[PDB]
C-alpha cells in the first residue's frame, strides 16, 4: 500500500524521483538550529549551533532466510458474474460460464470437476516479490561488500562483518548471485486433464526473448555468497511454469537490463488482473530492503540469529480457465490499482518508504521491550488485541503494520488479511540472554560494558551479555508527532539540577528521569560527563553514540536502584560549537529550542543530493479525469490560415494570426 | 533570458547591432557634466566640471573548470496530452499517446518501460553551451594573450599574467584549442532497445557536411593552453550521439565558418523544441563570457582560486520516440521563444548583457562581504532566505540571480529551478586571509600595502595580505537605480562635514563617517590628500582608483576601529576647477548635480565605435490566445529582494525584508 | 564592538571612556589604555583609597 507508507514521511520532506545510491551505507537525517542556554546564580551563558545533524545509519546488509508457507487465496481479479451476493465462488455459475465460452466441448465436464480445487489457488505474491528483487539487483549492482570491514565502532568496543556473517566471501551485489533458469513450457489448449502442482499464467501476445530469461530466474533458488538484503536465501518456487500464450514462447536470451523487468511485471499484472497480489509483494520488500546499523554496541542482539521470511507458495490456475478473467473484474476497494501505478511512475521512492517502516517498527520495539509481563498489553499479547480481522497466523506484515499503527496513532486498513513477509519480534519473545561477539580496542572496556572477562588485553575476541534489548534506532522521521518521555524528542525541554555551595561540585541524582535529561542536554552543549553508580560501582558515559547525539537510560546496561554521583570538576569540552561550564555555584537550569528543519542525506562522508522531477501524491481521480476527458477533441486535421501583412520595408514578409 | 538582462542597461543607452572587438580589454563608462557649489565660514565658491569620464575595465581572461553534475529535467517541448489536468507527467497517458500513433502495437509495453526512466532526465543545456562557445571562438578568433603583460598597474605595485595564471603560454584564441571529434552515428528506425548512456536528437532533412563537424567538436573535451573565458576546461559530454535523420548523414569536412554554427543551432532547437534549454545556456554563458579587471590590487583575491562551472549531464530521448514531440507542445510561459529569437537576430548583444550581469553581482558582493556574521541575513544564509522554489542545490545561476534581485530591487522569476553555471562566492565563504602575489615597482611600497617583507627593492616579488574582500567594480550601468550610503552614487546630494582643528599642520579625524565625507569632498574638488592611520602606521590616499572618480572607505585597507592624522600642508593640486580650494574653514557644504550622460567605450587606448543599424524591439505579450491564467506557481523559481537599512557604525552593512 | 575587531576598541568620546575605566576597577580589572595621537599610557589603578 503506497498510500499508508507515504503518510509516514515528514511534512518538510519534499522527495524527487531519482536517487543515485553508490554505496552500502546511507546516513539519512535533518539539519536543525539548536538555541541552548545555561542559567545559574552567577549569570547566563548562551550558545547556538546553526547546523546540527541528527542521523540514523542504514545499510544494505542483513541475514534473512525464506521458507514456503500456506496462505489464504486472493480472489480479486476473477469476473464478477460467478460471485454470489455474500462474495464467494458460487459453483454452478462457473459451469454456466465455461459452457458459454470458446472452450473445447469434450473438456467442459472434466475441467468443471477440477474447478472446486484449482480456482482457490490464487496467490502470485512470491513471483512478484522475486521479480522486484531482480529489478534492484541490476539497478544498484555496483555496490560492494568487504569481508574485513567495520560493522560497528564506538571507540571502546568494535564489531567486524566477519563476526556476525561467517561463510561470507567479499564480492559486488551483481557478482553475488548466479541464478539457474527454470523451464517455461507452452500450455497446450487441448490437454486432457489439468496438471495440479504446476502453475499456469496468462500473457498478452508473444512472450519476448528477455521475458523468458526473467521468469526463468524469478522461479529459481537464490544461493548468495555475500549477505545482501535484496539477495537473501529463497527456496525454489517451482520446477516448471506453463504460459497460455497462443503466440509461441521465444527461447531464453541470457542477458537483460533493469528496464526489461518493469516490462515483464506490467504485462503479468494486466493479463492476470493481480493488483492486490502486487500490493502484498510491495509491503513485503519494504520491510526487507534495508536493515539498520545498531545505535549502540549492545544493540546488535536483534541481528545475531537470522529472521525467517514467510513467502506464500506459488499457485495460479488462470492458464487452464481463460474465460473466467475478463475486463469486468471483482474488487473490494475502489483504489486497488494505486500501488502498481505509484511504483511504475517512481521506482526509487521505495527506499524512502522502506526506511520509514523500519524506523517506525524498531522505535516501538524499543519501548515495548521495557514493559513487565504481568500486564494487559505486554510483550506476548500486543498483536492479538490490535488485530480486528481473521488472519491464518499473527506473523509477517500483521506484526509490522500493528507497530506502525501504535507509532503514528491511526487505523491501518488492508483489503485481505494476508500474513506474509519478515517477522522481527524473534529475539524479544525468546526472553533469554544473547551472547554478541566483540573485538576490544582499549584495556579499560569491561567497567562500561557487561563483559564476560574482567581483564582483557587489546585485540582479544570477547563476549558481551545483553539481557534487556536497547533501542536499535532513534526517532527522526517520526520526531515530535507522538512524543514519549523515554526518548524525550520535544522541540522545547528544560532540567533543574539543585546544588548548594557547601557541596564542592558533587551532585547525587536520586531521580532517574531528570538524570537522563541532564546527561542528554550536556552532550548537545559538547561536554563529556562520566557518572559513577554508588550501589553497584559501575560507570556510564553520555558519549555512547556518534549519530543521534542523545542519551537514552538503556545506556546504563543495568536495572537496579538509582544513585548516580556526577563530579562537576571533571567535565571535559570535546566537540566544537559548545557552551563552557567553568565553575558552577547554586542551582543550574539547562534549556534548548529547535526552530527549523531541512532534510539531508550523507554517503561515503559526502552529501547525497536528490535529482529528477517533483514527486506528486498520485490519486485514482487524477488519471480517470483524463479518461472522462478521453481527449474528446474530434481527431480531424483542421488547418487554420495566416493573412500576410505588408509594412514599410516590403522586402521582408510578416504573418498575422487572423 | 533576454528581457531580464536587457532591463539592467540604463534608460539613455540603446546599443547598435554589431561590435568589432579586437582586444582582450574593453573600458565602458559615460561622459557626465558635474555642477559643484561650495560654501564654508570663509565664503562661497561656484565651479563646473565640463567633461568627467567614470568607467570600469572588463577583460576576456578568467580561470574556470567544468564538472558534469545531475540536475532537474526541463519538461518543455513534449506534447500537451501526456500531461494531466495539473502540471504533472502521468505515465498512464504516455502509454495511450504512444499506442494511438503506431500500427505495430507489439512494441508499446517495451517502449513505455524505457520512456518512463529517460523522460525524468532530459537536458540539452550543456550541448547548446559548447555550441555557443564555438560560435564566439571563430568570430573573435584574433585576440592575443601575452604571458609577460600587465594585469593590474597602480604605480607602487604590479601584477603580471605569469602570476595568477601559471601553466600558460603565448597563443591566439583560435590557436588555444585543438578539439577532437566524437562519433556522430545514424539511428536506423527498427532498433527496439535504446542503447544506454547515448542521447538521440531529431534533425530537419539531411545533416550537412559542416553540421557534422560542429556536433562532433561540441561533445568533445576542451583542453586550453592560454587562460580564456570562452575556452575554459570542460569534461567530455558523450562518446556517441545518434541523429534520427530520414536522409543519411554526410562524413565530417574538418573546417567550418562562424555563420555555419548559427545554422546548426537554429535547426537543432526547431526540430527538438528545446527553446527553454537554450535560455538556460544563454544565461549560463552571460556569467562566464567576461571577467572584471580589479579596481585596486587587493581586489585580485576574488580571481586566485578557480571557480567551478556546473555543466548538466547530456541526456535526450527524442530520436528513439519521435511520437512524444508533436505540433502541440507544452510550455509554462507564453514568452518561451523570445531568448532564441533575440540571439539569432542580434548575436553581438550578449557582450552588453554579460557586462550588465557581472557588474550587478560584483557590486552587491561589496556589501555582503561587510555584513557581520551574527545577523538573520549573512554571507552563509542570504540565498536560502531569498529563493522560493525547490532546486537540487543553491549553486550556479541561483546565487547570481539572487544578487541581481538585491541590486535592482525587483522580483526575478524563471519557469524551471535550474542550478547550472559559475559559482563566484568561494573566496568569500572561508575565514582565511588570502595571499595575493605582487611585484614591487617603487621602494616605498611597504608603507601603503600590507606586505610581508617591510624592506624591499624595485624588481623583488613579494606577497600582500587581504582579510576583507574590497569591491572589484564600481556602479556604472546600475548608477542611481538605488543609492546606498557606502558607494554614494547620487545624481544630486548635499554633503555636510565639520573640519577638525589644524593644530600644527595635522587634523585628527577620530570618527569614521566624518573622515569618509571629508576625503569624498576633497576628491570631487580635485585635491590629492594623504592621511596616516595611527593604529597600523600605514599611509592612505583618496586617489587610489583613477578610472572611477570616487572614494570608498575600503581603500583604508584595515577592518576594525582607528583614528586618522590628515596631512593638511602637503595637499597637492592634481585637477583644479574654479570651485577647488586648499584651506577649508568651519562647516564644509558641497552641493553637486550630474546631467548630460552619454555612453563611451575605449579599447587599446583608442575609441571603440558601434557599427551596424539600430536594434528594433522583439517581444511577445503574456497571452497569444490563452483565456485563463492557470497560475501554476508551485514549481516556478522566485527570488525576493532585500533592502539595505543604514545604521550608525557605517563600517557594517545590514539587510532587512522590504 | 563588532566581532571583526579582535578585542581592540577606540573611545572617540571622553565621557564614556571615564565611566568604562572606573566601573572596570570596581570589578577588580587592571586596564591599561594607550593614546594614539601623543603616544602616552594611562592606568585605571592610580589610587588605593576611593
Amino acid at each position: 500500500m503506497s498510500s499508508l507508507l507515504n503518510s509516514l514521511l515528514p511534512e518538510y520532506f519534499k522527495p524527487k524521483t531519482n536517487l543515485n545510491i553508490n554505496s552500502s551505507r546511507v546516513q539519512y537525517g535533518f539539519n536543525a538550529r539548536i538555541d541552548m542556554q545555561y542559567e545559574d546564580d552567577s549569570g547566563t551563558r548562551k550558545g547556538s549551533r546553526p547546523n546540527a545533524f541528527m542521523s540514523n545509519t542504514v545499510a544494505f546488509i542483513g541475514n534473512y532466510e525464506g521458507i514456503i508457507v500456506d496462505d489464504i487465496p486472493i480472489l480479486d481479479g476473477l469476473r464478477a458474474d460467478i460471485f454470489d451476493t455474500h462474495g464467494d465462488l458460487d459453483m454452478g455459475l462457473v459451469e454456466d460460464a465455461l459452457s458459454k465460452s470458446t472452450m473445447i466441448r469434450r473438456n467442459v465436464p472434466t475441467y468443471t470437476a477440477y474447478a472446486s480445487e484449482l480456482l482457490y489457488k490464487r496467490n502470485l505474491t512470491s513471483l512478484f516479490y522475486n521479480m522486484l528483487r531482480l529489478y534492484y539487483i541490476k539497478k544498484w549492482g555496483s555496490i560492494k561488500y568487504e569481508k574485513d570491514a567495520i560493522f560497528y565502532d564506538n571507540g571502546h568496543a568494535c564489531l567486524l562483518n566477519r563476526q556476525l556473517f561467517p561463510k561470507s566471501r567479499d564480492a559486488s551485489l551483481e557478482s553475488s548471485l548466479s541464478l539457474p533458469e527454470a523451464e517455461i513450457a507452452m500450455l497446450d489448449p487441448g490437454l486432457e486433464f489439468p496438471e495440479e502442482d504446476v502453475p499456469a499464467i496468462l500473457w498478452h501476445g508473444r512472450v519476448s526473448s528477455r521475458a523468458t530469461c526473467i521468469l526463468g530466474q524469478a522461479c529459481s533458488e537464490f544461493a548468495p555468497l555475500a549477505p545482501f538484503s535484496i539477495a537473501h536465501y529463497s527456496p525454489q518456487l517451482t520446477r516448471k511454469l506453463f504460459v497460455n500464450a497462443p503466440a509461441g514462447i521465444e527461447p531464453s536470451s541470457g542477458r537483460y537490463t533493469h528496464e526489461d523487468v518493469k516490462d515483464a511485471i506490467t504485462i503479468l499484472v494486466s493479463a492476470n488482473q493481480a493488483y492486490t497480489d502486487f500490493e502484498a509483494a510491495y509491503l513485503m520488500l519494504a520491510q526487507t530492503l534495508v536493515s539498520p546499523v545498531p545505535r549502540t554496541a549492545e544493540a546488535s542482539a536483534w541481528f545475531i540469529n537470522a529472521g525467517m521470511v514467510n513467502m506464500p507458495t506459488l499457485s495460479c490456475a488462470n492458464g487452464y480457465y481463460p474465460a473466467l478473467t475478463n475486463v469486468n473484474p471483482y474488487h473490494r476497494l475502489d483504489t486497488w490499482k494505486d500501488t502498481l501505478n505509484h511504483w511504475v511512475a517512481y521506482p526509487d521512492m521505495l527506499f524512502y518508504h522502506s526506511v520509514a517502516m523500519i524506523e517506525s517498527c524498531y522505535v516501538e520495539l524499543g519501548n515495548v521491550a521495557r514493559v513487565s509481563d504481568s500486564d494487559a498489553i505486554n510483550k506476548y499479547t500486543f498483536t492479538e488485541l490490535s488485530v480486528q480481522g481473521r488472519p491464518v497466523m499473527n506473523r509477517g506484515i500483521i506484526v509490522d503494520l500493528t507497530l506502525v499503527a501504535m507509532r503514528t496513532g491511526r487505523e491501518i486498513s488492508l483489503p485481505y488479511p494476508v500474513s506474509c513477509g519478515l517477522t522481527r519480534t524473534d529475539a524479544l519473545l525468546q526472553g533469554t540472554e544473547i551472547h554478541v561477539p566483540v573485538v576490544v580496542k582499549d584495556i579499560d572496556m569491561p567497567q562500561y560494558y557487561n563483559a564476560i572477562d574482567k581483564d582483557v588485553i587489546e585485540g582479544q575476541e570477547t563476549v558481551i551479555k545483553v539481557k534487556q534489548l536497547p533501542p536499535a534506532m532513534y526517532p527522526i522521521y517520526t520526531y515530535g508527532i507522538n512524543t514519549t518521555e523515554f526518548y524525550s524528542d520535544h522541540f522545547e525541554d528544560q532540567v533543574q539540577v539543585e546544588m548548594a555551595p557547601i557541596d564542592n561540585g558533587k551532585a547525587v541524582f536520586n531521580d532517574a528521569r531528570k538524570f537522563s535529561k541532564f546527561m542528554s542536554i550536556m552532550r548537545m552543549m559538547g561536554n563529556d560527563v562520566t557518572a559513577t553508580d554508588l550501589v553497584t560501582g559501575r560507570k556510564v558515559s553520555n558519549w555512547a553514540d556518534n549519530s543521534s547525539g542523545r542519551f537514552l537510560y538503556t545506556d546504563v546496561k543495568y536495572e537496579g536502584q538509582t544513585a548516580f554521583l556526577v563530579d562537576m570538576d571533571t567535565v571535559k569540552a570535546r566537540d566544537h560549537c559548545w557552551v563552557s561550564i567553568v565553575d558552577p555555584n547554586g542551582t543550574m537550569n539547562l534549556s534548548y529550542k529547535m526552530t527549523n528543519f531541512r532534510a539531508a542525506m550523507f554517503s561515503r562522508n559526502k552529501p547525497l543530493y536528490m535529482t529528477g522531477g517533483s514527486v506528486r501524491t498520485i490519486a485514482t481521480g487524477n488519471y480517470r479525469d483524463a479518461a472522462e476527458r478521453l481527449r474528446a477533441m474530434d481527431e480531424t486535421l483542421r488547418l487554420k490560415p495566416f493573412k500576410i501583412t505588408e509594412k514599410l520595408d516590403f522586402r521582408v514578409a510578416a504573418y498575422a494570426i487572423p
Side-chain angles (χ1 to χ4, degrees), chain A:
Chain A
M1 191 75 258
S2 62
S3 298
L4 81 88
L5 285 182
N6 208 323
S7 58
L8 263 56
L9 296 183
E11 205 75 358
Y12 59 82
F13 196 69
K14 294 300 197 302
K16 297 187 182 296
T17 69
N18 300 128
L19 180 64
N20 192 52
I21 293 167
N22 65 319
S23 181
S24 65
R25 194 154 293 182
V26 182
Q27 287 186 42
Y28 84 98
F30 59 81
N31 290 121
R33 175 185 167 79
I34 312 173
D35 289 317
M36 300 169 289
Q37 183 166 22
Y38 174 83
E39 181 158 37
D40 193 40
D41 287 340
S42 66
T44 71
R45 291 166 202 162
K46 297 168 65 177
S48 182
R49 291 210 295 172
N51 300 317
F53 187 55
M54 302 175 72
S55 75
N56 275 9
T57 318
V58 165
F60 272 96
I61 67 174
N63 57 326
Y64 303 122
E65 265 159 29
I67 47 160
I68 309 303
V69 302
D70 184 36
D71 200 287
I72 63 165
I74 312 184
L75 288 168
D76 281 9
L78 291 166
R79 65 191 292 176
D81 301 356
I82 63 169
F83 282 101
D84 73 330
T85 322
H86 308 103
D88 194 284
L89 294 180
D90 178 36
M91 311 215 95
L93 299 182
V94 167
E95 187 169 33
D96 191 282
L98 260 72
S99 182
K100 299 155 76 288
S101 79
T102 75
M103 201 171 204
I104 309 175
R105 199 56 48 201
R106 64 184 269 279
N107 282 27
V108 166
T110 181
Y111 271 60
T112 300
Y114 268 102
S116 306
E117 277 87 19
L118 283 180
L119 260 59
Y120 286 112
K121 291 201 187 184
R122 285 185 62 78
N123 208 323
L124 278 164
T125 308
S126 197
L127 186 51
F128 288 123
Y129 179 76
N130 283 32
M131 285 215 290
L132 254 68
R133 286 198 301 166
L134 283 178
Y135 176 89
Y136 288 112
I137 284 159
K138 288 230 146 285
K139 189 161 192 170
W140 306 326
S142 59
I143 71 172
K144 297 201 183 298
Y145 171 90
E146 297 91 333
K147 184 176 172 63
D148 301 319
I150 314 289
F151 183 72
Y152 187 79
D153 182 28
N154 68 282
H156 297 342
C158 173
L159 180 43
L160 297 175
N161 278 300
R162 189 178 64 259
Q163 298 294 330
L164 292 187
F165 312 113
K167 314 196 226 302
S168 179
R169 308 216 318 282
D170 60 322
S172 58
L173 178 51
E174 184 263 6
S175 185
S176 183
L177 292 170
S178 181
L179 296 168
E181 308 193 338
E183 182 180 353
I184 310 302
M186 190 197 315
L187 184 68
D188 192 5
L191 209 153
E192 196 197 325
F193 55 94
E195 308 186 1
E196 59 162 29
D197 281 306
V198 176
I201 68 186
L202 258 56
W203 205 269
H204 277 296
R206 188 169 187 76
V207 170
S208 58
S209 193
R210 284 143 183 279
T212 302
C213 187
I214 295 157
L215 287 177
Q217 285 182 26
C219 308
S220 177
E221 190 177 34
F222 284 64
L225 305 179
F228 280 106
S229 48
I230 77 166
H232 68 74
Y233 178 82
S234 180
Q236 187 174 24
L237 263 53
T238 181
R239 194 185 61 76
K240 204 176 77 182
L241 182 68
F242 281 123
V243 177
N244 185 233
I249 300 156
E250 287 176 35
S252 188
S253 181
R255 60 170 286 95
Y256 62 97
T257 60
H258 73 268
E259 295 99 322
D260 300 335
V261 174
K262 184 183 284 187
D263 177 37
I265 288 164
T266 313
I267 293 166
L268 190 64
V269 294
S270 188
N272 293 307
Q273 292 283 344
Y275 292 89
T276 313
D277 289 281
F278 186 85
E279 188 179 317
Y282 187 79
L283 282 171
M284 272 181 67
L285 187 58
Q287 296 170 125
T288 183
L289 191 77
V290 300
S291 89
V293 164
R295 198 184 84 80
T296 78
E298 59 152 18
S300 308
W302 297 90
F303 324 119
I304 295 295
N305 45 19
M308 294 289 176
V309 186
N310 295 284
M311 303 178 70
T313 187
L314 179 58
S315 60
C316 188
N318 291 320
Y320 301 120
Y321 306 87
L324 298 182
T325 313
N326 71 333
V327 305
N328 184 57
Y330 167 77
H331 57 257
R332 286 180 171 176
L333 305 183
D334 207 295
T335 72
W336 75 299
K337 292 188 177 181
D338 286 29
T339 313
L340 180 78
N341 289 16
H342 192 92
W343 182 79
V344 168
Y346 325 107
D348 295 316
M349 268 286 289
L350 180 57
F351 180 82
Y352 299 125
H353 287 151
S354 183
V355 295
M357 193 161 203
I358 67 162
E359 179 268 306
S360 293
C361 299
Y362 275 95
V363 155
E364 200 82 54
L365 289 187
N367 80 312
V368 151
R370 308 182 314 94
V371 304
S372 53
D373 301 46
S374 56
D375 209 313
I377 310 168
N378 69 318
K379 187 202 293 183
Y380 290 103
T381 80
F382 78 94
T383 74
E384 291 176 11
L385 282 101
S386 54
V387 168
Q388 195 177 194
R390 295 186 302 95
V392 165
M393 207 176 293
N394 56 336
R395 54 128 188 281
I397 199 62
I398 296 293
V399 54
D400 281 37
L401 278 183
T402 197
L403 285 169
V404 166
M406 288 166 63
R407 189 68 234 158
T408 57
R410 289 202 309 282
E411 307 92 328
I412 309 310
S413 178
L414 257 59
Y416 283 75
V418 68
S419 57
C420 58
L422 180 63
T423 183
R424 307 194 171 284
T425 62
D426 186 276
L428 184 64
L429 293 180
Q430 204 77 50
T432 75
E433 262 178 9
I434 310 96
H435 289 68
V436 309
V438 149
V439 55
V440 290
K441 289 317 195 177
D442 69 54
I443 323 100
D444 61 307
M445 190 269 282
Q447 289 98 62
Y448 292 88
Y449 293 114
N450 190 2
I452 207 81
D453 278 72
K454 281 59 61 187
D455 199 325
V456 279
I457 60 93
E458 62 87 34
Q460 185 184 150
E461 294 87 291
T462 195
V463 173
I464 308 174
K465 302 210 307 306
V466 177
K467 207 172 286 155
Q468 193 176 34
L469 299 173
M473 298 187 79
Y474 191 90
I476 282 179
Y477 278 174
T478 63
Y479 192 98
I481 61 168
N482 192 286
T483 181
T484 80
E485 285 280 313
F486 174 53
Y487 289 118
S488 71
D489 59 329
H490 303 107
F491 299 124
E492 310 181 354
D493 206 340
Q494 60 281 318
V495 56
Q496 178 160 31
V497 177
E498 212 166 2
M499 289 167 62
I502 192 63
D503 308 320
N504 50 315
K506 306 174 88 81
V508 173
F509 286 82
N510 65 80
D511 192 359
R513 181 169 161 284
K514 70 160 61 182
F515 171 72
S516 181
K517 277 200 289 183
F518 172 75
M519 289 278 280
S520 69
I521 292 170
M522 283 285 283
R523 203 229 171 283
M524 293 192 208
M525 289 178 180
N527 294 315
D528 183 39
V529 183
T530 170
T532 170
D533 298 36
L534 289 170
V535 178
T536 317
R538 71 169 63 265
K539 302 174 73 185
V540 308
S541 183
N542 61 334
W543 275 63
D545 189 29
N546 254 45
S547 62
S548 69
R550 302 301 197 84
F551 186 75
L552 305 180
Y553 182 63
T554 57
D555 297 29
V556 178
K557 312 172 197 293
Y558 174 72
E559 197 284 310
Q561 199 66 235
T562 62
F564 301 98
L565 181 65
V566 60
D567 198 4
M568 296 205 74
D569 73 342
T570 61
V571 168
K572 294 139 169 37
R574 200 162 178 183
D575 261 335
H576 201 269
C577 306
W578 57 284
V579 310
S580 63
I581 307 178
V582 276
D583 46 357
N585 56 324
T587 309
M588 309 189 302
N589 303 127
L590 298 91
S591 178
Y592 67 87
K593 290 185 183 176
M594 300 196 161
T595 170
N596 59 346
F597 297 88
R598 301 179 299 284
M601 295 179 71
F602 280 74
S603 179
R604 290 175 137 187
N605 309 130
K606 285 165 60 199
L608 192 78
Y609 294 115
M610 303 188 293
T611 70
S614 61
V615 168
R616 50 152 182 172
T617 74
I618 66 101
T620 323
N622 280 229
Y623 177 43
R624 67 107 194 89
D625 61 34
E628 274 157 27
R629 176 58 221 183
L630 175 138
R631 193 173 92 75
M633 294 315 307
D634 54 327
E635 301 95 319
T636 60
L637 189 71
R638 282 191 284 92
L639 300 162
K640 265 155 172 81
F642 297 126
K643 180 168 66 266
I644 190 158
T645 67
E646 283 151 307
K647 59 95 201 179
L648 60 138
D649 198 345
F650 142 89
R651 183 164 166 77
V652 295
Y655 278 107
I657 290 84

